[PDB]
Amino acid sequence: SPAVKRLLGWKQGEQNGQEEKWAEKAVDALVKKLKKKKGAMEELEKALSSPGQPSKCVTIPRSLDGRLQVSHRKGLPHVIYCRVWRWPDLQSHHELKPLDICEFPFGSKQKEVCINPYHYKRVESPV
DNA sequence: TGCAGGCGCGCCTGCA
DNA sequence: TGCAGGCGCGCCTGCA
Ligand SMILES: [Zn+2]
């Protein structure tokens, strides 16, 4: 997919042949989800292209669990995309704190969850 | 063209 | 309660 190629140019880090193919499938699962909503893909690309410039929420439906499954692998969606485009070494959701600018941060128990990586800041995980 | 096979969501179990 | 992983219906789409 050509959209997956433009977003994968923003991917951080150096992953192996298996993990590069997994992030490609994770980005594809997200593109397939944001294509139904008008302006969602454009907002994500803008947020990724201009890091230090304000961006709107880019959300997907919240599962009861909080997990998103991509190629039989389970994980929280906002952690997945924050790892792809910002912090490859992100250990867990405990290392993310939402910005006041985000309406749908993870943990807000709303119908939608924001996956815009620049709507979270990286923090040290507590004891 | 269409439906079969692939695989995610949502249920569960098991520690902790 | 949180979190990891098994399982199978049901939605989807790729290739027969
Ligand atoms: Zn947001």
Side-chain angles (χ1 to χ4, degrees), chain A residues 53-90:
Chain A
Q53 152 159 213
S55 60
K56 296 191 191 189
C57 290
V58 174
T59 69
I60 58 167
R62 175 172 72 96
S63 61
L64 308 67
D65 204 323
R67 300 183 291 181
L68 167 76
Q69 186 191 299
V70 175
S71 216
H72 304 276
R73 192 179 297 177
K74 281 166 145 166
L76 311 176
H78 74 305
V79 184
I80 290 168
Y81 298 118
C82 281
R83 288 207 252 252
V84 172
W85 293 305
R86 307 191 67 187
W87 313 292
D89 64 325
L90 193 65

Side-chain angles (χ1 to χ4, degrees), chain A residues 57 102-104 114 119:
Chain A
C57 290
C102 185
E103 178 179 9
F104 312 91
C114 183
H119 276 206

Side-chain angles (χ1 to χ4, degrees), chain A residues 25-44:
Chain A
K25 293 166 156 169
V27 166
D28 176 72
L30 183 61
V31 169
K32 202 188 164 306
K33 281 180 184 319
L34 313 176
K35 229 63 181 180
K36 72 180 182 301
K37 318 162 73 165
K38 206 195 149 180
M41 271 291 297
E42 288 68 37
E43 198 61 35
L44 176 61

Side-chain angles (χ1 to χ4, degrees), chain A residues 1 39 70 96:
Chain A
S1 168
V70 175
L96 294 175

